[PDB]
């Protein structure tokens, strides 16, 4: 009968559509290009759904996280669109606030609840990311710790591969 003010569930793919249209203010607009487009949205929130979560204000998309998992010790290019079923780890491909919401602690919130939604899985042993140096002591605040030059390559930008112990 209403639209919750506040409400935090996993995603499905009803929702590629709002998920990329935070991606392109996000990403987008600023470097050009976003983790993942709508095909790649669509991809992981069809195979591991509970490997994603979505904060909704007033039926509204205003923070989001989406996952996937990987079987190695580091990322590579082949798993940005990769899910392992058997693997250990939760890939954190992209996370993201709405302009109008951000500096709030909407992320930090949705971060600790995701590694901890996560973390409650048999599988999930690990959680892992990539990032821009500027985030790395942002990170940190949630157990992650610098692993070093992350291989991935993204067009002209460069990332610093982050690990946390679950
Ligand atoms: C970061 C987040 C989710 C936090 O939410 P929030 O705004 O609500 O923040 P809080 O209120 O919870 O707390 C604020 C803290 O967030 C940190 N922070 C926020 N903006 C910052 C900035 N410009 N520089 C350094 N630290 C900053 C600060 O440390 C700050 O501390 P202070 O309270 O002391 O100020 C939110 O700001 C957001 O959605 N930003 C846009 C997308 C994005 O970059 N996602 C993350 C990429 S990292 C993960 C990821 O998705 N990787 C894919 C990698 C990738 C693939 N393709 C790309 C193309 C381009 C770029 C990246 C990629």
């Known amino acids: 009968h209403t639209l919750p003010a506040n409400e935090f569930r996993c995603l499905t793919p009803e ?5 990329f249209e935070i ?20 991809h992981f ?22 996952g996937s998992l990987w079987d190695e010790e580091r990322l590579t290019q082949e798993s940005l669109a990769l899910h392992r079923p058997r693997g250990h780890s939760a890939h954190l491909h992209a996370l993201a606030v709405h302009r109008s919401f951000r500096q709030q602690g909407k992320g930090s919130v ?9 973390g409650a899985q ?14 790395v002591p942002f990170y940190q605040r949630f157990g992650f710790h610098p692993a070093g030059p992350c291989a991935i390559v993204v067009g002209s930008l460069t ?7 679950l």
């Open 45 to 66: 929130l069809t195979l591991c759904p509970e490997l994603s979560l979505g904060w909704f204000v007033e039926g509204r998309l205003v923070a989001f996280i989406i």
């Open 159 to 165: 990332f610093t591969e982050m690990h946390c112990s």
């Open 15 to 19: 929702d590629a559509a709002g998920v």
């Open 110 to 118: 949705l971060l600790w609840r995701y590694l901890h939604h996560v």
């Open 122 to 135: 048999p599988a999930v042993r690990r959680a892992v990311l990539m990032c821009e140096d500027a985030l």
């Open 23 to 42: 991606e392109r203010e996000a990403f987008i607009s600023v470097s050009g290009n976003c983790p993942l487009n709508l095909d790649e949205v669509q």
